[PDB]
Each structure stands twice: as structure tokens, then as C-alpha cells.
Symmetry: C3
Amino acid sequence: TSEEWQGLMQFTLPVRLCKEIELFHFDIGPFENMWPGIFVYMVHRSCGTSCFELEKLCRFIMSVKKNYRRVPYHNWKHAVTVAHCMYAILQNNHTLFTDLERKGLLIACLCHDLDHRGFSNSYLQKFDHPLAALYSTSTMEQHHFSQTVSILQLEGHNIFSTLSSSEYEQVLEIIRKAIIATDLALYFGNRKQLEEMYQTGSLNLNNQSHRDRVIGLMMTACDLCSVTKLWPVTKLTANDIYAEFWAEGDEMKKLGIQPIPMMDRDKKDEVPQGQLGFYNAVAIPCYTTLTQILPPTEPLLKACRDNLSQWEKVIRGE
Amino acid sequence: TSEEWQGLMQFTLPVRLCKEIELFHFDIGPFENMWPGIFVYMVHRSCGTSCFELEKLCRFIMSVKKNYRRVPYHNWKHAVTVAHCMYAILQNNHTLFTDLERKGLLIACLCHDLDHRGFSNSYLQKFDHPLAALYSTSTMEQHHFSQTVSILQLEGHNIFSTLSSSEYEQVLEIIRKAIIATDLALYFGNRKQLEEMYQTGSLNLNNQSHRDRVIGLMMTACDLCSVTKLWPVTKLTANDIYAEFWAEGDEMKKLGIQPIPMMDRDKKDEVPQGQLGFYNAVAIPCYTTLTQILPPTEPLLKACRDNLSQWEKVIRGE
Amino acid sequence: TSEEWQGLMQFTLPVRLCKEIELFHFDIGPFENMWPGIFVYMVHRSCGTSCFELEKLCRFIMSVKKNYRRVPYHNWKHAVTVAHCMYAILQNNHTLFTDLERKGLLIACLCHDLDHRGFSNSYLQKFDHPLAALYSTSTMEQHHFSQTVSILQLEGHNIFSTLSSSEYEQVLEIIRKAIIATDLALYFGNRKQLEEMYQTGSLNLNNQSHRDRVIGLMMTACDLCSVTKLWPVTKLTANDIYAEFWAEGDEMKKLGIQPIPMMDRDKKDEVPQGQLGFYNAVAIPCYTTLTQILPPTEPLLKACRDNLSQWEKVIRGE
Ligand SMILES: OCC1CCN(c2ncccc2Oc2ccc(Nc3nc4ccccc4[nH]3)cc2)CC1
Ligand SMILES: OCC1CCN(c2ncccc2Oc2ccc(Nc3nc4ccccc4[nH]3)cc2)CC1
Ligand SMILES: OCC1CCN(c2ncccc2Oc2ccc(Nc3nc4ccccc4[nH]3)cc2)CC1
Ligand SMILES: [Zn+2]
Ligand SMILES: [Zn+2]
Ligand SMILES: [Zn+2]
Ligand SMILES: [Zn+2]
Ligand SMILES: [Zn+2]
Ligand SMILES: [Zn+2]
């Protein structure tokens, strides 16, 4: 049978990639046509060779790719990068997650920014974009999930067709919650709740609502993982995100609205302090809380701390 | 019938767009996939819901889009922007124009820079491009019109198929003259003639040759309308046009010809004075004459004057 | 017959192009859709109107184009530029080369960088790219040749189908050797051998191994021909190559490897001295040796010398 022949197959990467893909700070490289293979490899190792039908998975992956846009940061490379961080979390906490969760979370990460235009929820609201009329909150994130379902609905694209309806409904809910959780506006309340539950000892991974919250934080951690890379990667990637943000600031000015310094290219000089503030207020607390809940995710926090030190070095003119 | 069902249809934009599209200084925004709908809306309001068969118009619009190139300024965004300025002129002088003219002029504006390479007529002549051998004068503009006719000749693309042959010939002549008029070399003589006829009182919109001249000036006014936007739009758009011009200057240098300061990136510092000179010699006289002939086009002149003041502020180092 | 109708055909370029295409320092221009015609013209003049079936050649050319990538330097424009330099060498040494060699070398030049990613052999090795596992030496160059053969194997793409098998095997060997010779690592040993054989008088174009070496040097000369253009062309093209090199340097830093100053954008200021060193160590000796072997290639050396002077002028701050 087809599933039998698939069980005999072994998917391998080049030697350096096989070794370094296990590291949290792995960078996927500039060879775009290797990314699909990298994702398949990760799915194989974290889920199993029989989790997805290979032909369907490849078809799905290429369609997801086609539905990411040629924008500076929120692109296909970001999608695979976020997926890899999830892989590393899964592999280092392999005891904790079900079959459905491993399937669902890697797919959720790959799909989490589908059809991103390089503009924030705030801008879409102020422009009065049709998406903002349909989705009052988490505008882009609800769209990302809608795009995911649409791709799954294409002929030969349902990678979950081997699942029972019950399991299918569960995995789609996992994916939905995970993608919505990438709305950074929702992160602040989520992390606060998680910190409180952790300190009191009420936090319980057997409780579905608590489990959803931890998955949420994992999604934030993966989404921001560019700050957990080695310095050259982190610093160069910052150029990409600011390219998007400054373009949005330009568009804000065209609406006759003064953008916040973050989106304003005239405030270029304040970038190092802006990043410092972001690490202090968002990135460090995220990875700190994550490391408390899932201790094997410690390398993410260490690398984030190292990058904070690098930004401090930039500020001092050193 | 199909035309009956179309009469029942109402095309609407988002609230902010419905309001602000009526303003001369409206900016069409960064969401490319909304531009076709914006054009259809404008056609509906200025011409009527029964002017074009919707299916044919949409097919036409997408083919026009496909025949604009990925250049910094003379692109699809410019085409829709010029079309919008015409819409605003038409709507504020709604009493003056025939059914054919409203149809023709919006289409002419949409098509007026079709297949632009980002190079001037001068460069094509000096390179010895095949187009310069075919069209001795108004080289690119004659090509733009040729492209328009070719698109109209495609199966299911004749948006004027409901017209009599007589009316079809008239609308094509309207379009031809309008597109040729966008050759800025022809603007100077046209505006001079118009000014003289206006001051003596010989100018008569019932005279076809006079009417052609006024339409010509309207085309210049729409073509240059980026100078009639709010300052942030006008200033940022200047970056796009200079990207094209400097690339042409580079190509001139490659032919062993010293380009004029306008096309020379080494003369970056002279941009503010260059713009001032352009507003004084071209833009202000254009909108001044247009406002004299068509008083409701006054906001274009006011906004142009405001931008002149902004360039003066740049020059002073303020 | 078809070949009879082809014999009656005359392919012509615009007047300026017909004249200036014969000059070594000709630049192919910014009009991409003219490059195929320029190549066909060159094939017609250097080989003959009956060398290739026109329909097949056009199909081949467009497929080659499609297999070059949108990178700053190693692109479709580079391919045609290298092909033109070969044309000029062939036309000025028209007595020396066989029918097969003229066919083969123009095609080899057009195909010599097929599917280039904008990264060096060194980077592919350090990344551990699958291509480096397949080709231990001349990694990209072996791939370029593999791509060439694959394109030739496509239905209706075998431009050599009129050749006997013996002649087909010969032309493919000519192409293979020529493309491999564009590996600059191999140039140093080749030029040294050629210089020694020239000075002793052992160099003999009737000896196949010697002939292969001279063709090799011709390939290096064509590959580097951007340094033999007029100053504005040479200087602007330098921007393109450094865009690629600096991107590679970025990627090196992402691997945790300090790149050499050549690939490091932080060493921007050292570009003029870097170019001077390159002209001294590589470019001048290449064209010097080539001019010794083939005296009519003298203009390449003169133009290279002129550009060396220009870089010296940059260094002095003049
Ligand atoms: O190192 C690359 C990563 C940096 C953080 N990344 C972000 N992810 C999600 C949202 C925003 C991200 O980047 C930021 C975060 C904070 C800022 N804050 C900020 N405030 C500023 C004030 C003045 C000037 C610049 C400023 N940047 C800017 C960009 C992803 C890529
Ligand atoms: O604000 C954006 C609009 C500016 C005017 N636009 C033009 N439209 C048609 C032709 C030329 C346009 O832009 C100009 C106009 C005049 C100049 N003149 C000029 N002379 C210069 C001398 C030295 C240095 C720069 C110079 N620019 C440059 C660009 C469209 C976009
Ligand atoms: O003028 C345009 C041509 C310049 C030479 N070109 C090259 N072709 C093949 C390989 C490398 C080419 O460009 C070079 C050659 C040498 C260098 N060397 C160099 N060393 C440097 C040290 C510090 C800073 C910059 C440096 N560049 C850089 C680029 C093609 C385009
Ligand atoms: Zn997102
Ligand atoms: Zn994201
Ligand atoms: Zn034009
Ligand atoms: Zn225009
Ligand atoms: Zn090469
Ligand atoms: Zn090359």
C-alpha cells in the first residue's frame, strides 16, 4: 500500500542541517527551495512518517507558500522560521503533547501569517479596510485562519482527511486558537494570567483552558523567535521588520495621521532604545514565563538576554 | 435580463472611502486589490450602472492592470490615481460632458501610460528604440494608445460593444486625443492657446477643436495630480518619480551622454529647487488656467499652491 | 522548404545597434525584450542564418531566460553581455574557429550562469548545500552545465538536432569545458600555463589541449567583460556585483563565520582599493595574456587599463 511504502521512506537533510536544526537558534538559510524539505523533515521527526500523506502535505505546503506575499518580514521565510521554533519546543517537551497537538501546532505556525500585507490591525482599522468590517478584533489573525481553512478546502489539500470528524474538529480548534494567539495585543493579558497561575500553583496542563493559554504563550514565543537567534541574524532581521513598519508609517502620514515613533522612519535614531524597551516590556517577560512553565525552553531566554545586551552595546555607541 | 439585474445592483465602498473619494486630494491607498473596485465605483457614479457590462469591464480592467509594468512611478497605481482625478473633475462639472465623454475619459486615464518602461521619449530616441522609428513624435503616448486598442480587440474585452459604430468611433477618438495630450511637450503650446482664447472670450466649449484643447488640459491636470495631494503624499511620490528619472540618467551615462540635472542622481541636492522651478513653470500655470476655464477645479490649484509653499520651506532648510 | 525560407530572411537591428554591436564596449541596454533579438542577430552574423532553426532557437532562448534568477548581477543581462563579448572575439578572429566552435561558444556564454543563486561555491560548501555534495569542485559551474543539458533535452529545444551524433558530442564537450572554465578558481592555473607556452612558443592552436586552454581564457575574458566597458557602465555594474557579495557576507555572518572583506558591507570604504587589487591581480593579466594570444582582442585590454586608471582616481579622492 501507499502508507506502507511511506513507512519504508527516510527523509534526510544535509549533515550540517541535520545537526543544527535541533538547536533553538537554527537559521533556515537563504535557499527558499530547501524550506519545504526542512518543514517535511520536522513533521516527520516530531509527528512521524505516517502522520500525513506525503503527496497531500507537499501540495498543501506549496499552496501555503503561494499565499504568503512578497513583503519584507511577514513572508514565507517567517512562516517556516516560526514553525521551526515550535518544532524545537515540541522536541524538547516531547512527553507533554498529543498526536493531534504536534500535527496542529506545526501547521498552525506555518499558516499563522497567511496573506499578510505588511500592515498592522491598527492600520487596517484606520484605512477602513473591508477586513476590519468583518473582524472587529484580531483582524489579520482571523483572516490568517480563514485563509488556512480555504487552503484545506482545496481538492487534494486536506492533510487531515485520515482523521475522524471528532479529531478533525479538535485539530482545527487547536489551529484556530494558536493563530489567534499570535495577535500580540492578546499576549499581555495571557502572560499575566499564566504568571499568576504559575506562582499560586493552580496552573494545570490537564485543564484545557490552562493548556490553551500555555499554547498561546508558545505561539508568542515562536512568533518572536527572531530575537532568540544569534546576533547577526537578530540584527539583520530587524532591518526587515522596520522596512514594513516604516512603510506603514508612510501610509499613516498619507491618511493625515501622525504615526507612533515605532512606525516613523524619521525616528530611525531611536531604534536601539525602541528595541531595548521591547525586550524589557515584551520579549524577556515572554521567554521568562515560558521557561518557568517549560524549563527545556531555557535556551530561548538565554539567547534573548544576549541580544538585549547587544542592543545595550549599540546604545552606548560601543 | 442581464442588464436588468445590473440595474438592481448597487456597488459600495467602505464608509471612509465613500466619503473621501469625492475629495480632489483623495489617495487610493496601498491595497492594490481594492483599486479595481474603486475604478468600477467611479464609473458607476460618473457614468451610470448601465454604461458598461460589469463582466466585460472587470475583464478589461484586469488586462489593463497586467499591461502596466513594475516600475517605480509609471505603474498601475499612477493609472488609477490619474483616473480618480478625472472622476473628481467630471463630478464637479457634471453638467458639461456627454455620456461618451465620461465613458471615454475615465478609460483614457486608466490606459494613458500602458506598457510604460520608466523611460522618456527622449531616451527612446537616443537609444534608437524600435518605437522611436515607428512614432517620430509623442513616442510613448502613441504606444499607450496602440496598447489600449489591442486590449479592446481581445475576446470579451470590448467594453464599447453596446455602442453604435458611429459612437464607437467617437469614443476612440476621444481616448486617442486624451492620451496623446499627456505628452507634456504638447502641454506648453496647448495651455498658451487656451489662455489666449480665454482672455479674448473666443474660447467656446461648443467648438470641437476648443473642447479638445480643454480636455487636453484636463488630461495634463490629472496626469500631474500627485502635486495636488496633501504634503506627505506629494513628497513621498516625488521619491518614486526620481527613482525612474535617475535610472534613465544612469542609462544616458551608459550611452556616453551627460544627462540633464533632472535625470542625474549626482545632483540630488538640487531636487527642492528643481521642484520649485517645475511648480512655477508647469504645475501652477496648468491648474491656474484649468481653474479659469473650470472654476470647480479650484481645489487642485489651492493644493498645488500649498505644495509649492512646502518646497520653499525645504529650500530654506526649515 | 523551411530552411530555404530562412535563407531569404534578413534579421536587422536599429541603426545605432547595428553599428555599435561590433564594438567590444557595447552595452546591451535596459530593454530586456530586445536582448533575445540581439542574441539571434549575433548568431546570424557569426555563425550564419542556417546554423539554427529559428523557431527552435527562439524557444531555447526563452527557456534559458526563464532559468536565470532575479538576482542583482548573475542574471539574464549578464548572460547576454558575456555572449556579446564572445561574439566580438569571434568576429575579430573569424579565421580561427570552426562552425561547431562558433555555435558552441555563443550558446555556452548564454548558458554559463544558468540558475545562479547569487552565492559563491565557497558559501554553498559552508552552508552544506546539496549541490556541494554532488559536485565537490566547480560546484555552481557543473550545475550550470547540467541546467544547459536539461534545457536541451526539452521537447522542441534541441537546437543541435541537425548535427550528426559525432558533431553533437563535440559541441556539448566544447560547451561543457567552456562553462567549467568560468570557475575563476581555475583561471589562475590556466593563464599561468598559457603564458609559459606562449613565451616558449610551444603554444599551438592545432593542439586540442592548448586550444581548450585558450577557449578557457576567452571565457574568463568574456565573463569579466564588465571591466572592459566605458567607465559609467563599469562603475554602475560594480554596484550590482557588490549587492550580491554583501548579501553573501550577511549569510556568512548568519552561519557564525566572519566573511572576507570582499563580502563584508561594513568594509564599503575599501571597495576602490579592492577593485584596484582585482584589476592588478586578475583582470589586467587576463586581458594581457589574451591580447598576446589573440592580438585583435586588444581593445579589451585598453578599456580595462582605462578603468584601472579610473579606480586609481577614486582612491586619490579625485
Ligand atoms: O530582531 C528582529 C525581530 C525584532 C522584533 N520583531 C517584532 N515582532 C513583532 C512585533 C514587532 C517587532 O519588532 C519591533 C518591536 C518593537 C519596536 N519598537 C520600537 N519602538 C520604537 C520607537 C522609536 C523608534 C523605533 C522603535 N521601535 C519595533 C519593532 C520581529 C523581528
Ligand atoms: O510630487 C510627485 C510628483 C512630482 C511631479 N511629477 C512629474 N510628472 C511628470 C513629469 C515630471 C515630474 O516630476 C518632475 C518634474 C520636474 C523635475 N525637475 C527637476 N529639475 C531638476 C534639476 C536638478 C535636480 C532635480 C531636478 N528636478 C523633476 C521631476 C509626478 C510626481
Ligand atoms: O565593474 C563591474 C565588474 C567588477 C568585477 N566583477 C567580478 N567578477 C567576478 C568576480 C568578482 C567580481 O567583482 C569583484 C572583484 C574583486 C573584488 N574584490 C574586493 N576586495 C575587497 C576588499 C574590501 C572591500 C571590497 C573589496 N572588493 C570585489 C568584487 C564583475 C562586475
Ligand atoms: Zn501575525
Ligand atoms: Zn508572525
Ligand atoms: Zn505618460
Ligand atoms: Zn502619466
Ligand atoms: Zn559563473
Ligand atoms: Zn558569469
